Structure 1
């Protein structure tokens, strides 16, 4: 996988325009790219008041299965593994996308301000593969419903947020 991040331009211009726009905007560079994101750390409202104390901040001032052990589980899944996804949660994802498209084909009579209802067809398989990995987290040759449904909810929240 990839990792792409840097200080965004115009400060927080990312808030006004798309979740992207850390670098140039041209829609051609964005073509092969798949997923965009924003990070929440514990400083958001420091832009209204706390900034004062912030500069005053300048003036007047493991608990988990070990890192090597996660690498060990990962090398032992590179060795041999078959934790595939489950058909029922798979059809549940298919539902919570297609029925969204049907509610919105019905709501086209409302003439939504959403520019152009896109084909969420690569993001969908992205969610499918992330639930596959969350099933790899549980060795189940047919995916357990817990991790798959959690990932489903969280990625529909993500996709929905992006659509918003």
Structure 2
């Protein structure tokens, strides 16, 4: 009973999103957008039934593609550890409402999958044909992220220094950097938020998202028509459902009964940065 007040105080702050994002794998350098996506996946959306008997998915699906050495398995392990229910496979029934991480991609479960390039390493010039999965299975994923080995002389030095500092200082002290939440506390907070309530969208946000979806569909049209080639990542109503689910998850993170326009804007920005860059 006492922990309810603690969770309410934690979720009533104006900076819950930043604290949660920083709490997602503080050891890993960079990937703030990836950390936020992982956090909103862990919070997840809300499922809704229909009187006709039909059900709509309330879980988010993410896919990651990149060269080896981009710390993909570490994120999967951290997600499995943090999630109240978590399964890790090398490539479903026992998981109910949890998260299933799937490495080497080449029942109410959220799916987080990692995969490698067809040729082993990404080729920027070739563009498409670097993903072997068919568009039919690619459409199920709510978001797709691409990671490339951005070779910078200063970035390698910074990464080496960060790794060596993590190696050295870890026996000395194990303390939060800046207000980071403990693993058990974050686990209980996520469970409490998931159990307590689930929000719904608003009319103005719905109209804004509809207009943005129409504009994005026209843009994907024009890109495909000018390129004279079929995009391996199509845009359909499932993308709109994914954006709605991400906005609902963002509203759920604040425990508000109704979603705001800021959540929809953040969901649209994340969806753009992931899919449009990937596509």
Residues 104 and 66 (structure 1), Cα distance of their counterparts in 2 relative to 1, 3 Å cut: closer
Unaligned runs of 5+ in 2: 1-109, 165-175
Residues 80 and 39 (structure 1), Cα distance of their counterparts in 2 relative to 1, 3 Å cut: same
Aligned residues between the structures:
145
Offset, 1:143: 0.6
Residues 19 and 159 (structure 1), Cα distance of their counterparts in 2 relative to 1, 3 Å cut: farther
> 190, 202, 208: which is aligned to 1:74?
190
Residues 66 and 87 (structure 1), Cα distance of their counterparts in 2 relative to 1, 3 Å cut: farther
| Residue 200 (structure 2) pairs with residue 84 (structure 1) | yes
Matches within 5 A, 1:90-109: 90-102=206-218
> 120, 144, 147: which is aligned to 1:39?
147
Structure ID, larger Rg: 1
Residues 20 and 75 (structure 1), Cα distance of their counterparts in 2 relative to 1, 3 Å cut: farther
> 250, 253, 258: which is aligned to 1:134?
250
Offset, 1:142: 0.7
User: Does the Cα contact within 8 Å between 2:251 and 2:260 map onto a contact in 1?
Assistant: yes
| Partner residue, 2:112 | 3
Q: Give me the whole-angstrom Cα distance separating, in 1, the residues matched to 2:144 and 2:199.
A: 27
SS in 2 for 1:13: coil
Q: Give me the whole-angstrom Cα distance separating, in 2, the residues matched to 1:80 and 1:65.
A: 20
Residues 20 and 140 (structure 1), Cα distance of their counterparts in 2 relative to 1, 3 Å cut: farther
Offset, 1:103: 6.3
Q: Give me the whole-angstrom Cα distance separating, in 1, the residues matched to 2:128 and 2:113.
A: 16
| Partner residue, 2:272 | 156
Offset, 1:19: 8.6
User: Does the Cα contact within 8 Å between 1:135 and 1:148 map onto a contact in 2?
Assistant: no
